[PDB]
Design a protein around this ligand. Sequence first.
Ligand code: D23
Length: 294
Amino acid sequence: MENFQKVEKIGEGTYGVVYKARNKLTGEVVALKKIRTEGVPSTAIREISLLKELNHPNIVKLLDVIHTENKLYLVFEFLHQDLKKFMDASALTGIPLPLIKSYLFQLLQGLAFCHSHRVLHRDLKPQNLLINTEGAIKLADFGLARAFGVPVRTYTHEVVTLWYRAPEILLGCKYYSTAVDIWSLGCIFAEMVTRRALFPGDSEIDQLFRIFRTLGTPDEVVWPGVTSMPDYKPSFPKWARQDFSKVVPPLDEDGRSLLSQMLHYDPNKRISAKAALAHPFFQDVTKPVPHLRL
Ligand SMILES: CC(C)(C)Nc1nc(C(F)(F)F)nc2ccc(-c3cccc(N)c3)cc12
């Protein structure tokens, strides 16, 4: 597009590159995503257009959609970094606990807002949570995820990650719920306290068996229905559930209560965003600022 000085490339999305740009109309700085090519479908457009009205402090704002002859451009507010890089920088340290539960609390607000309008994200992961220098964190690629996608390669042939994918999706359910995003957020929570990914699978069945080694192989008592799932196999090994105080040391007890409720197998039993926001863990939630290099 012509009203946009492209300043810097700042990434490979699942759908396209992202540039930092200046809007030469308004003088604003912007993240410009440039998606696909021919010929982009009606339904993608109609869906994505109306994301312009899904606004909240913790969703990154979608400023405009441009469809031109024949790519899609999405232009977003600009945030200076993502969670994965901040975790890598905080490696010897760990993000402080106050800042962990601040971020978790904000994401959990952003999620409750989306789920009250029945939109799922469904591909939540550290690199599409975006942070600023004032201490906010925001959900990016909301609704894109399942307007186009999710491919197992991106447009760069990059493998998309499995690490945060809920088990009902791995077991081949078509009609999953907002509980999907709660599973993912819980994996990310554990990765912040431990500084290590919780379930770093490198295929679907590896991913799936890594969950089983830690939470036990699921059955009909803990999850009614499991046994009927498309990709369930009688022949799955049966591991026993691990004691939860070694999975996420040294979270305190309120942190492990919350985590395990976000990681229940049965997606009807795991906790909602709304309900999570009432959990005792957030009794003393602060608002830390990351101070940050930029
Ligand atoms: C597509 C993907 C979600 C992977 N990434 C990003 N998407 C968008 C958005 F606004 F276009 F969504 N804006 C972004 C803004 C900044 C960054 C960014 C910039 C510098 C360092 C790191 N680690 C991430 C990544 C972004």
